[PDB]
Amino acid sequence: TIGFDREKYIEMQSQHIRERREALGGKLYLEMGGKLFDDMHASRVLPGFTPDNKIAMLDRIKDEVEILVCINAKDLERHKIRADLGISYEEDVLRLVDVFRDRGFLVEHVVLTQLENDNRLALAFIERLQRLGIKVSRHRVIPGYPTDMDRIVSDEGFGLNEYAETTRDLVVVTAPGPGSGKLATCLSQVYHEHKRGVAAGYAKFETFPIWNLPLEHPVNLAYEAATVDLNDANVIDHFHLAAYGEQTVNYNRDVEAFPLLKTLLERLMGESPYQSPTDMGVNMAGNCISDDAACRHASEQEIIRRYFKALVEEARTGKDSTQSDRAAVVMAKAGIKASQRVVVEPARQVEERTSLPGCAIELVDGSIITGATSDLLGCSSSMLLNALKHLAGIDDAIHLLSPESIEPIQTLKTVHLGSSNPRLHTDEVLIALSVSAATDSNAQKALDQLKNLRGCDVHTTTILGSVDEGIFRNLGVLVTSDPKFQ
Amino acid sequence: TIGFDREKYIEMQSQHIRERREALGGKLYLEMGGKLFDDMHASRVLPGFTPDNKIAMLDRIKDEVEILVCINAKDLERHKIRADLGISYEEDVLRLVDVFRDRGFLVEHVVLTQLENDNRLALAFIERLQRLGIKVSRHRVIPGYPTDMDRIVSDEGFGLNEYAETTRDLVVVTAPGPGSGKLATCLSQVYHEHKRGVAAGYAKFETFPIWNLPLEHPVNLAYEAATVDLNDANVIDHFHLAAYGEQTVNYNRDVEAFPLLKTLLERLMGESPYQSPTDMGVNMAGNCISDDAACRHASEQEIIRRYFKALVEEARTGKDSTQSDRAAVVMAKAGIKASQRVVVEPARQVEERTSLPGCAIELVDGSIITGATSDLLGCSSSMLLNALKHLAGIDDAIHLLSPESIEPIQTLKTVHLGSSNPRLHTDEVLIALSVSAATDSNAQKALDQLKNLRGCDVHTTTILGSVDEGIFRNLGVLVTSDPKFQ
Amino acid sequence: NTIGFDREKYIEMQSQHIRERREALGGKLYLEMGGKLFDDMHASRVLPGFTPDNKIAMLDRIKDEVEILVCINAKDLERHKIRADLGISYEEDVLRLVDVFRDRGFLVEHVVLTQLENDNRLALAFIERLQRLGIKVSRHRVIPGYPTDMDRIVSDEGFGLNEYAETTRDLVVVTAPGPGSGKLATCLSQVYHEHKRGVAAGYAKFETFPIWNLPLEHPVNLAYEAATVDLNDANVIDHFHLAAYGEQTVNYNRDVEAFPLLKTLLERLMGESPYQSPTDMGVNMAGNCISDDAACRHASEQEIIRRYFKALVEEARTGKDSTQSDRAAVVMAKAGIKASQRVVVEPARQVEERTSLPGCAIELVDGSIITGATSDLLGCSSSMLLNALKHLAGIDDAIHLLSPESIEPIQTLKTVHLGSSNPRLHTDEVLIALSVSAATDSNAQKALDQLKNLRGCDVHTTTILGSVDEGIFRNLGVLVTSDPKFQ
Amino acid sequence: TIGFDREKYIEMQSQHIRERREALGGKLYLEMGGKLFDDMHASRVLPGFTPDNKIAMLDRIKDEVEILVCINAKDLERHKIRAISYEEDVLRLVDVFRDRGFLVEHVVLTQNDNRLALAFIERLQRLGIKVSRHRVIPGYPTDMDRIVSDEGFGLNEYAETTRDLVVVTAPGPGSGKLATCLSQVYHEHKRGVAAGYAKFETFPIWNLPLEHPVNLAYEAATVDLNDANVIDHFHLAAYGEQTVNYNRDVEAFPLLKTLLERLMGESPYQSPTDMGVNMAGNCISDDAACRHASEQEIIRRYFKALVEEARTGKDSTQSDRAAVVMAKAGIKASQRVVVEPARQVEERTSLPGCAIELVDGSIITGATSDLLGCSSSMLLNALKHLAGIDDAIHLLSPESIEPIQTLKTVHLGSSNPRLHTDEVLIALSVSAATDSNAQKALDQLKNLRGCDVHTTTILGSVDEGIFRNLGVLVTSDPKFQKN
């Protein structure tokens, strides 16, 4: 079931953004915190929110939007790798430039922040961006930032930065990751705009946490589960509560950094338009939840997944249990147990009764199908075949794997590869199923059902090898594992 | 000036703790967070709270109290030191026993926590404790702490720990500092006492932050200025707000650790007596403010002092400005500027017009007295003599330093100690003053006033050496400094 | 597969020389046997003719004169210290050592628990598990002044608190799951307990590398330095041996620095010092059994190159600085070699330069260089394998051996069902497709028969291989190097 | 006692440098590794070697040499330091060399568009030093084709050095001074002028045994793990004679050797030893005096490591290493002659103890009393002995002591009224105006330079400062006083 109104969000969020820039005098510099194109978390947590949803929102107001990309000069020189896509910050900029241009957005400004020694790596980067039509501004390390208010709002502070001559009244400031100077750029650009007589302002866009959902709401709790540091931990926005008497949710980093930002905005704009970091924000995501219970369920399931993710990561690295302990605190605050992920206990029951690794899946149906380790099959392979048989309406005692589709694999494994265990992994079972599908109707009926395993939850009692992890990712199944090896 | 009722505090706090044990069955383990004996911060921040005020509170209920002292075993084999006193954690345990026994408190238990039997330095400390007639209980590392509730509340958890055979019904649990396992000791004791049929409970005692003072109160802000960690930053207690609808102050570390703590108390006691970390506490200090203005002023001044201490500390070590920036945020939340410390600008004016280090003091009187660098005197030495002259009513033109006292020190430094800078530091000026006082009456009257420099504020435009900082420490003078060397 | 080490001479010589050492030390010897015992793969690649189990096969000549003793640090039990080479604990490694030695009929009846104290109860749980398995277990304690205080150790307060192991055979080989199990300290204790009993006993060490009678700059010794992560096991000239005898020998930092302090410890337990150097202390004959120096030199020079690339890749995977690869590049210089001299390197990136896609190359046992390029159907490693198997089997290069009856169901699975726009086949699924093709076609069967002849062959790839392909090359016994680059 | 011939070093070392350029055709670029001014280590280890002995060596051939200073680009921006910064140290080297009258007109910038590095060029030219610019090479040691070409050494600006003996030095290690010499040799060979390279360093000494106390003392003075002395196996396989070099240079030699085969036609050197020019060991006059002094230094380094580990809370890595060096020399910590007398005082009194050894050889001790700290007691007793004053004489007047103690107790709230080193010396100075004995004692403060001291507890900053000013070498047992 779906609990987020995608279309309302596109209309409401983009309109709120437009309303904010009118209130700030006609031009807006908007800091985007987080992922713009691939927010899989938000898609699992707010069912109906597409991974691309923030981009589809901007798409509605595309003709009023400019994209500006920030990048730290140290991140160009350290060759800082972004963990998600596995590329350098340098390459991630160019990838952001053309992907926005693919979908028709105006991108003509890259700001190079924290520029120290000018360098040769950076010189080679400026001209590479000049050939692609984009003008690149040089921004400096501002003396006495963020405390020396007199120095900052002066030509000895923000005046050191080259002003990016933006064309449209709504500038969307984004970056490969944190530490890129987005806020600093936004505030610098506002300063220069005020020197030009152009009334301008700053605001922030972030999907999580949701200011107008309770701190104890599963959606907000699931965000805490998706985060590493205490800096990201949700708190009551005490600035908002002192000013208005209304309870809202922000987080440690932005609450800690607000008082210096408020002073900074006061000097840049006469008085501050914001009493709280809640006011500073622009997020309409909470107003577009169309089924609260569905989102509660979805994000409670996200929390449990995060706990097992952390345990498996800790087991692989040999790290202490910092991350899994934090996720357990979140579980306690949500009032949920790990048993509430319905594939956990049946998978363990299989391992109990067999003394061998176990496995369970929950179909779209709702049915729990398990898998067990045998001579022929590993438990995940066994789980796959059993699930495929169930939603193909195939009888439980029907074999759908030819002997001559099995023999060539096991012969290779034992005679040529020297494997003492002839158990088939998830990849080799699927191959043997696909070979069986040449002559068997049952096997073909089974194969056609692989596409229906998307979004389904799986628990295993042991940590999966690289092969099984691969296949389950390709089919789009969400896997958790008990943190044990084989 | 006095803004805190010491006597009311001793009555109210002792009574509230008594109420807490009666409400919890009749036996209480009370964790004492913070300095117990020389809480200088509290004395500056709450004029009327004495450095020993917590002990004077326990003195009211001396015959009902036992002291239990915790020490982490892993702190011994790192030779962890208490930076305040310049002694090891190991020597501080022996100190805490001695000073408590001198005041007539019953102290007979030391709990050594996190003990692994390959720690030869920790077991050497055990026999060192046993020969002085101290009972030593051994506490171990609990696997699955703090998440695995079944493991913790069992024989494989708290049942691993030895039991402190406590005589009195109110057990005050203290340590040389954080990480000593006070809380775990309290909870282990409750487990072992419930097994023996005795009703036992846990509560916490901390002076700061003050739960019933607003988050934006200078007293609570001063505490934030005294901290070096995000973990200690003040947050609204959201558990308390959700449960009762009343706004109270707590902080990150306890708020994050509360959900697992609450569950732990339920398993230990049957049901939880506490819906919040606020409920868990016992602090009554914020009901004992007799003058709000005096406390506000005192703690505003403290915020500025902390800001200058961080700036200096970063200059000595070469660290970045994280801590001083954090104090500036607190200055912003209090709505105060560094200039509100009255000794800052006069000291700076002395430097601005001499091109040499300057120095200023505020006497109890309110008078601002400065000192300048000369051929004979460093600026702090010069400031002292000027201040002593002012307090004693000695005319400005009078030289209270005979050339028979000055000459031997100069001849020692240049001829024998080979320094090229012959000007005197504060210690050698005070020696010269004391030598002069044997024959001169004015010098003796000046010496008499050193007494009255206690608690006065000082600013210098240059960082002091160890000697000068030592002398000001002895005289109880509160020194700040601009982050520059000579 | 060219032989440069005389393994029959070694089994004769080393056994005779070890036997000659105990007779010169009285009649009893406690021999410290460090390093890899059954699986010395490094020594098999560096000294061609040396079998991985050559140290054990040496003892199998004299097995009726040999008793094995297994040491274990008792503080590695509570710590749960694991041997990284296999994947089990130091506890279960002791049992794994006992039955693998009893397999070859060695008399094993003694286990020594060093660093034992009464406070450890998992340690005492292991004592009773071992007594039931049939072995006598002796208890060894901690010594407060060890090793720097000579006075406590000798008399009672040190070795007097250790339990004596009543060994039947006159040569006792002292073994442990890994470094730091008190194997040296056990050896010295048992000599003391037998000199108190009347029997003249002694201590010696069995190390295979570094080889003492080859020069410091010899590629064999250099290969061992290339194999070292720590800098404490760096090869040095034994200056003690140079000062005492005038002959230049090779030892290493750890034993050389331990020697002053250990020489005083020998005198107090035996009377005089039988050793004037760590070289004297040793017993290694492997240097005297090189039949072809040029073969050993070449084989070890190739090993150095392998270590360089495997460091580069390890740094590329874990995101670390170039510490150990720069170190491995220095020993490359000392040998006077470069990465080009691994003959499969330039051919592989010639493929990459002319195609702009990942490249790959193998050297066969016959000596030929067989390359592999990335096509639409195949990965470059999969391509290289099919090409190499064709050359080995005498099959014409124009012959397709992969039947589309075997190709299609994999391809159809990957694209329609798995949703991958990468229709390329890795080495595993190619070997599967070759196995299915072996039914209808006899050409695929003839290719599958020569996977056997790939053990020992060198491969270079221009890209860092995945887990699956590297698993397949390990299983085939193929020695792979890679350039530190991704696709 | 003197075991090193100072004047002989000045001649023989400068002469050997001169002969090296004659063997290498005519012009020499000479790398100076290590401390050039104020080498206090070499002064203690080779008694008679003055701290400025290397500067006085160059001073004899002043009119034949040119000082060239190297600085790495990366050392500027991180504010790289040594106890001020690398920033002002090039500005401090140049103006201190010209004081004695050396020719300094070249600074080479090692390791393009930089904001503070283009402005550092203009700082040099405005105060009279020409500057060459040297770039980073693709493949630093290994790629032999890229170095000896236009693609590497061809990129660098040639330094127009006047004199035929160029002393190449730097603020510290890793400044690429070796790479400068090799580039300069390349640039002159293209100009027809024959040029060459050699390395100058004092320690380790090549013609002393590996385990000689002097060589061992250098290992004891270094923090890095990969800085051990080794036998020069290159020299051993080539000439058959046993020689000492170190890890860093022995490791780096084969790549340096192929680089010298290209940049000079034939290989000039077969060893790191050959590469060297050191004559220090040929100038030792009393081996036993140098053996004794460097053994004492080893011991000092051990105690210094122990005290530093106790102060900082660090692991015992550095002190264990110095214990290993002691054992390599076969010496105990007790063999610092003032160690045992000092802890005998602590054995009897149960209070911190103290011992000095005078230039005489006499061991004078000091004890904790109600009036005096043991360091202050030891001082007065040592000063009495040196001045020929009887030990029973009180050289401190009651009117000098009283005002200090009254200040500490009555006014500065102390429990402990006993006098520290600085306080006893003020009292002695007050007493010197009235008493001849006190003045005769103060006179003797100059004769404490070089004297060894062991205390049983770690000294405070005040007491440590006093002994520094006097030039006293203090060692302490890693214990603090009871608080």
Side-chain angles (χ1 to χ4, degrees), chain B residues 341-361:
Chain B
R341 175 168 178 75
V342 299
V343 291
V344 168
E345 292 179 349
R348 291 195 185 149
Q349 283 168 235
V350 177
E351 193 180 67
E352 279 168 27
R353 72 128 226 145
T354 54
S355 310
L356 295 176
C359 190
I361 186 167

Side-chain angles (χ1 to χ4, degrees), chain D residues 3-17 30 32-33 35-36 39 42 46 48-61 200-203 205-206 277-285:
Chain D
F4 187 83
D5 203 330
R6 180 193 193 270
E7 194 60 45
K8 202 88 97 216
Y9 180 77
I10 293 168
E11 268 93 74
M12 272 165 55
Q13 186 68 81
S14 62
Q15 191 194 320
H16 200 242
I17 288 163
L30 213 223
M32 317 280 277
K35 296 265 280 151
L36 233 58
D39 197 337
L46 291 161
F49 190 105
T50 57
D52 285 319
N53 226 121
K54 301 178 219 190
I55 304 302
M57 181 273 298
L58 289 174
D59 210 288
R60 200 56 53 87
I61 47 165
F200 174 84
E201 44 183 27
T202 312
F203 305 111
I205 301 175
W206 67 276
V277 78
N278 191 28
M279 293 290 278
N282 277 333
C283 299
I284 300 175
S285 61

Side-chain angles (χ1 to χ4, degrees), chain B residues 162-220:
Chain B
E162 293 183 343
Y163 170 70
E165 306 94 329
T166 46
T167 333
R168 261 107 106 156
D169 281 339
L170 179 49
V171 182
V172 165
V173 177
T174 183
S180 293
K182 306 177 226 194
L183 170 62
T185 300
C186 286
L187 297 183
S188 181
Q189 286 291 123
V190 164
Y191 179 78
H192 281 285
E193 250 153 41
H194 266 82
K195 283 278 181 176
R196 298 162 195 251
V198 175
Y202 166 74
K204 206 192 177 160
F205 175 72
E206 264 183 329
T207 311
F208 298 118
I210 296 169
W211 69 272
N212 52 353
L213 280 198
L215 221 158
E216 42 282 275
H217 200 283
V219 175
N220 277 341

Side-chain angles (χ1 to χ4, degrees), chain B residues 78 85-87 408-409 411-412 416-417 427-428 430-431 434-435 438 444 447-448 450 466-467 471 474-475, chain D residues 313 399-400 402-404 406-407 411-413 422-423 425-426 429-430 439 442-443 445 461-462 466 469-470 483:
Chain B
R78 286 165 162 179
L85 293 158
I87 57 176
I409 305 175
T411 315
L412 174 72
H416 302 286
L417 289 193
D427 66 321
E428 21 190 39
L430 261 16
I431 283 165
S434 186
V435 170
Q444 183 55 54
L447 272 188
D448 291 344
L450 293 160
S466 55
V467 169
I471 270 65
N474 295 330
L475 290 159
Chain D
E399 49 269 350
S400 78
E402 187 273 324
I404 303 169
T406 310
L407 175 70
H411 298 288
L412 293 179
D422 70 318
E423 283 156 335
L425 261 29
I426 288 171
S429 202
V430 170
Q439 185 57 72
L442 280 171
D443 285 8
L445 283 166
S461 41
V462 182
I466 296 298
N469 300 330
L470 301 163
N483 286 287

